[PDB]
Design an enzyme around this catalytic site. Structure first.
Site, PDB file in Angstrom:
ATOM      1  CG  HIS A  53      -1.777  -0.998   1.554  1.00  0.00           C
ATOM      2  ND1 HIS A  53      -1.506  -2.154   2.141  1.00  0.00           N
ATOM      3  CD2 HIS A  53      -3.114  -1.001   1.184  1.00  0.00           C
ATOM      4  CE1 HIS A  53      -2.611  -2.858   2.130  1.00  0.00           C
ATOM      5  NE2 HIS A  53      -3.564  -2.163   1.559  1.00  0.00           N
ATOM      6  CG  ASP A  56       1.681  -1.055   3.696  1.00  0.00           C
ATOM      7  OD1 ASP A  56       1.056  -0.896   4.732  1.00  0.00           O
ATOM      8  OD2 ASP A  56       1.296  -1.816   2.831  1.00  0.00           O
ATOM      9  CG  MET A  87      -1.170  -6.212  -6.624  1.00  0.00           C
ATOM     10  SD  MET A  87      -1.229  -5.562  -4.925  1.00  0.00           S
ATOM     11  CE  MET A  87      -1.609  -7.020  -4.002  1.00  0.00           C
ATOM     12  CD  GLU A 180      -8.147  -7.774  -1.709  1.00  0.00           C
ATOM     13  OE1 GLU A 180      -7.262  -7.049  -2.159  1.00  0.00           O
ATOM     14  OE2 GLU A 180      -8.118  -8.300  -0.611  1.00  0.00           O
ATOM     15  CE  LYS A 182     -12.678  -8.012   5.449  1.00  0.00           C
ATOM     16  NZ  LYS A 182     -11.730  -7.236   6.243  1.00  0.00           N
ATOM     17  CD  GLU A 216      -8.040 -11.965   2.186  1.00  0.00           C
ATOM     18  OE1 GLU A 216      -7.364 -10.985   2.072  1.00  0.00           O
ATOM     19  OE2 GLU A 216      -8.613 -12.252   3.222  1.00  0.00           O
ATOM     20  CG  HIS A 219     -12.008 -10.837   1.829  1.00  0.00           C
ATOM     21  ND1 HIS A 219     -11.602  -9.799   1.125  1.00  0.00           N
ATOM     22  CD2 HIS A 219     -11.377 -10.809   3.047  1.00  0.00           C
ATOM     23  CE1 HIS A 219     -10.749  -9.135   1.857  1.00  0.00           C
ATOM     24  NE2 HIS A 219     -10.621  -9.745   3.015  1.00  0.00           N
ATOM     25  CG  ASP A 244      -4.935 -10.958  -1.899  1.00  0.00           C
ATOM     26  OD1 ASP A 244      -3.960 -10.842  -2.638  1.00  0.00           O
ATOM     27  OD2 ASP A 244      -5.528  -9.977  -1.485  1.00  0.00           O
ATOM     28  CG  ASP A 254     -10.542 -10.502   7.181  1.00  0.00           C
ATOM     29  OD1 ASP A 254     -10.277 -11.555   6.577  1.00  0.00           O
ATOM     30  OD2 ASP A 254     -10.031  -9.400   6.970  1.00  0.00           O
ATOM     31  CG  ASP A 256      -6.244 -11.299   7.145  1.00  0.00           C
ATOM     32  OD1 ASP A 256      -7.013 -11.731   6.293  1.00  0.00           O
ATOM     33  OD2 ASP A 256      -6.044 -10.094   7.320  1.00  0.00           O
ATOM     34  CG  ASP A 286      -3.735  -9.533   2.706  1.00  0.00           C
ATOM     35  OD1 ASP A 286      -3.115  -9.275   3.730  1.00  0.00           O
ATOM     36  OD2 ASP A 286      -4.538  -8.732   2.281  1.00  0.00           O
TER      37      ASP A 286
END
Ligand SMILES: [Mg+2]
Ligand SMILES: [Mg+2]
Ligand SMILES: [Mg+2]
Ligand SMILES: [Mg+2]
Ligand SMILES: [Mg+2]
Ligand SMILES: [Mg+2]
Ligand SMILES: [Mg+2]
Ligand SMILES: [Mg+2]
Ligand SMILES: [O-]
Ligand SMILES: [O-]
Ligand SMILES: [O-]
Ligand SMILES: [O-]
Lengths: 386, 386, 386, 386
Positions: A53, A56, A87, A180, A182, A216, A219, A244, A254, A256, A286
């Site tokens: 991102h 980040d 990406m 993406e 969710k 994902e 998700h 993902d 979520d 992860d 992810d």
């Protein structure tokens, strides 16, 4: 064996192994990782590349000189390790200004800022070699019914994506977009909640060919859907631009989890599909190392993501290669599923008495599908009991 | 008041009030209703019309003479009451021959029979005046991963719908198709599990304009999705051809409670959307009177479906009409959501310093959205506390 | 591979392999099975015993002479095979008289009839050798809130179980009772919906010692709960009298997949728990061969139940026996969880400055738990990659 | 309309209106609130009292002198307003030392520290007037199966609660304890996940009389359970010591919407139960103003909590007082559920041929329950359409 090499196209976000462990009910349990050290440590683990991102890599609010400096030292670690950036994405959800969304915020001035924030990071992602630009609208949505008129919000979502499509077309960039989906969290309900919803939305954009989906695992499982089935639809549509991978144990917040954890059989059918459909994009993780873990548990978790994909790849290939499985598939008539129903056409089907008036319904109703025997051969191969 | 009249376009399937109460763990608690008596009793209740599956009207396996006779006496009750048939569908899920599906059964001969079964009932539905022909693939799907190759199954699903599109085009019929999504039950996972998935699938058919969706309240709620949000996407796409109303209390087996029961606020936002978007199709109820009920509880339940829609219609209209609500909507900036983000274009947005470099992020981040005050005005109006 | 023996205590209900395939949207796909053929075929497969509902064995409505004949033929097959009957139960859910419950029906007379029907089958179960009598109140509950006052219904539920306890105590029977929880289906909400709720209710009966639970894998998973954690609490309480094994892939209708299918890692942790706690009762499978299957597929699904338990048993034993796993358990301080927090009492603890005033909170916060490295060792053992 | 009074016993946590808006994907959207301003503003709104976690009142790490100052300022605001403190709790979840739990952390020293931190706040709560001390083990649990032996962890959980019981008994304190169940989040699975599980565990403590439950609307709904049914069982057991009111729209992350939002009919049946059972404890709201809101929206959401409870209280009283509802309850035989099944004992019942041998099962099966007509009267009262 099950040792990852660059050839396996394994990628990780900066935000995954670098998650400090702050959740809704607790503070950070780990220090922040430097982006250069993450590149280093992942190249050592056999990773192919990293994603980011914008916030980040470049702390929100950095001056142009702090930005340059952050991009130079990152780009240097990438050159030094042979790591790629397949990406990149925008953070349109952390800063308070995005509390009602980015692209579909009720305030017009915040929607304009969200677009400029995105465009600035598309320029940087192209320079670093990224081919796919991901859009996760996590703040697009609502906790209550009158707060968001959803037809108008979709007018604003289509406007935003069309605007970015015109921008990359005018610049001649070789980048595509991946939406993406969710279903919820952090919003009560999020717009374009599943793979299906994102694929239908794309067909209404100005230049549909520029856009696909980035599904994902966790998700789609938050809505109780079968993730292998959703990926098969995206592949059938020619829209699986990126994927993902992680784990989720059911319908709840979520999680992860590292890939392979959560629903293990769904991870086996997903790998079998990716490998047999010939997907060639990155196998991106992810995930979040649990906040119970220190930095060695972070790299242990990251390594288990890649190890589990390689174990499942081996078991799925062994399954499909087995003559006894190829025999069980003919017995369950998966070969007849591949034959056209009526390539003779509707007028030959309508004049075909064996299709209706002389069809023996009860002889056909009595044929068992032998799906349980086939599935136990799949269970045996997954567990290495053959 | 809240008395239904034909003008309100309320419709009911033969299978709803006529459900005998047989479930996975128990036998029928009520006798079968004659189709002529259902038409009679619903016209008395203020219903506009009825719908049917072919096997609801004509017992499976009837000879051509038993069929004629069933259609004549039904058509007679319709003429006698002024009742219409706005929609019809095929039963491709009860008979054992459909245990692995209709259109996507692995056996080719069952897929051909499923198509001929459908085509025969399209001819009858057109004769009786139906404009919408619904397709609920409840047996299309799987309980295990290798039993169904989903890309090929979608090849067979697209083949089947394209084949029916050619058939009605060649006959010059004025009928359109509506796909009804359901995430699971009776199959472990069903293909095209949500509104989103059905809308994306339609864009890949030969003649997309012939097909839309028939969403059901309880089906989208079985995946924990917001049903008003899914309907807003279908309306935005111009694909809401029909709608099925009922209630569901959460993610569990499909309950088919009377409309208004289940998630009551979701029923309020759904009516507000249908009425403010000007939907003009039937308000169809696909529900099941609980098997605890005798035949008077069946008609009590059917009457409560229509009464709850009329109560919610009144509360939604009063809400939207309230100057204090119109004021709260301006305060939450729903008027700014309707303004284009960047009608000045991408090059004016990129040269606009107030959109980024001089945007005051923290002044914008501090503006409250006043969504809780607005939602409590919606709660007050729903409950009649204004 | 992995052959079922007698000593494995694998048992099956008459209604599992005997399920004819009828579900809420479809007719039966298989012929009814004779109970004596079921006993024979299961003895052949390596099962140790069979269980039954009274109406599985004796058709509802059979006079005391067909009852005689039915029990005689059945006992003959058991005599001939050496099959045992470890548990029996009453069908208080199929017949329409139980549409609002058995023990908690609002009608007093149906409740008396429910208790007489149960007591008749307790006499038969004891003479056939059953030590556990299961109660599954499938119809105890409601679809709406005023239909059932739950405090009064719990008074009636307690009354029914206390009367059953009095009856077996005055007869001197050895049998104990086991409540089978389920959160919903066929009722919108069932009373005593989870293991937790049934364990709490047992504590209010006049003879709590006579009663424990019979949890089922898929039923706790219908509420999204962790089935191994719930079994650990029933074992902690000393109440795991029996257990029902099957598979479920999420929160949705009750699937009753064969054991191993569904959540495969939960099945691994369940076997690891059962085997390490030395549970010694039946490993009973309450599952349904999918209705896609003919009778050969039914026996293939029943054999898969046993095979999966034996493969998981072997993988779980290998995980606990591995010196590196024993080492990873010491590293995650699983040995220190077994040490008492404060064995020398509350004034010891209050007088200890190292517990509060001098405890270094930051050094304790920074120790990683090393849980991901332990879980990947468990993942490697399950998949046989070690 | 509908004004909150003192006698309504409405209370709020310091952490509810004080929630700054930080969630897993975003930063705080609101400034921190001073505890004395919170006390003042809530007294103004008609709240009867406030509750706190120790770290809401005294910052973690404050010496015994800032602790002094903090308690002094706070007690001053209470003195000045007449606000009460009915309940208090410990924060055993925010600080990183509690990343694997408080009472059931694998590290012995963290468990001792957790008990000392709790006991310090029990002393403060008693002098401020709290009668109920809540325990919410948010961090007690696991994300993976071998990380936590649950039987041993329940030994440690029981040990912690027994030591707390010994301490308050040796001090002569009036206070009682209330366990707050939650199925998951922030842990993958939390120990004692539902009301049922917490009621069963209480029965194994050395002094069960000192302990009851504090159920929360949204937490039981995170497992898809019926919250009124769970409260009826805690009231049947005599253990409803306190209750937390809020809203939740489904099985997903913990929302903590204002009471009334979420499942509105469940909130109606809850109020009807609380008011008809004469619950006399605090009506405590544990909710979070959405982070979309500024501080005016926070106070608007807190006022909506109270308004909704009072509107539902009025609608539920009107439903039970209505002669047609009393008549519909007799018609559904809710009066007959209160009659004992067999007050003259088991030999009475066995000797009664009308209970079995002469019971007419078909006439009993055909009586309708008239539950839909009763539920539509409840629906009409809720919506004020009566
Ligand atoms: Mg995620
Ligand atoms: Mg992602
Ligand atoms: Mg339905
Ligand atoms: Mg429908
Ligand atoms: Mg079951
Ligand atoms: Mg069972
Ligand atoms: Mg909560
Ligand atoms: Mg709470
Ligand atoms: O994520
Ligand atoms: O349905
Ligand atoms: O079951
Ligand atoms: O909470």
């Amino acid at each position: 064996s099950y040792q990852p090499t660059p050839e396996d196209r394994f990628t990780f976000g900066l935000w995954t192994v670098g998650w400090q462990g702050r959740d809704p009910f607790g503070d950070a349990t780990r220090p922040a990782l430097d982006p250069v050290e993450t590149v280093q440590r992942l190249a050592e683990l056999g990773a192919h590349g990293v994603t980011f991102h914008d916030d980040d890599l470049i702390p929100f609010g950095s001056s142009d000189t702090e930005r340059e400096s952050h991009i130079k030292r990152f780009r240097q670690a990438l050159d030094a390790t042979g790591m790629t950036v397949p990406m990149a994405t925008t953070n349109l959800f952390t800063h308070p200004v995005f509390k009602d969304g980015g692209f579909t915020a009720n305030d017009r001035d915040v929607r304009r800022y969200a677009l400029r924030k995105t465009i600035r990071n598309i320029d940087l992602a192209v320079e670093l070699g990224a081919k796919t630009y991901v859009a996760w609208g996590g703040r697009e949505g609502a906790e209550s019914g009158a707060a968001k008129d959803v037809r108008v919000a979709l007018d604003r979502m289509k406007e935003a994506f069309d605007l970015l499509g015109e921008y990359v077309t005018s610049q001649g960039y070789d980048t595509r977009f991946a939406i993406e989906p969710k279903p919820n969290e952090p919003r009560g309900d999020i717009l374009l909640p599943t793979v299906g919803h994102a694929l239908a939305f794309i067909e209404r954009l100005e230049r549909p060919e520029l856009y696909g989906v980035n599904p994902e695992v966790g998700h789609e499982q938050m809505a109780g859907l079968n993730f292998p089935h959703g990926i098969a639809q995206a592949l059938w549509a020619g829209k699986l631009f990126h994927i993902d991978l992680n784990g989720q144990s059911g319908i709840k917040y979520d999680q992860d989890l590292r890939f392979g954890a959560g629903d293990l059989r769904a991870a086996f059918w997903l790998v079998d599909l990716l490998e047999s459909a010939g997907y060639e994009g990155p196998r991106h993780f992810d995930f979040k190392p649990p906040r119970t873990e220190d930095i060695d548990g972070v790299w242990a978790s990251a390594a288990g993501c890649m190890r589990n994909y390689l174990i499942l790849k081996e078991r799925a290939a062994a399954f499909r290669a087995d003559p006894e499985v190829q025999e069980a598939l003919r017995a369950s008539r998966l070969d007849e599923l591949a034959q056209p129903t009526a390539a003779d056409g509707v007028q030959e089907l309508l004049a075909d008495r064996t299709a209706f008036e002389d069809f023996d319904v009860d002889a056909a109703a009595a044929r068992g599908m032998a799906f349980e025997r086939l599935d136990q051969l799949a269970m045996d191969h997954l567990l290495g009991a053959r």
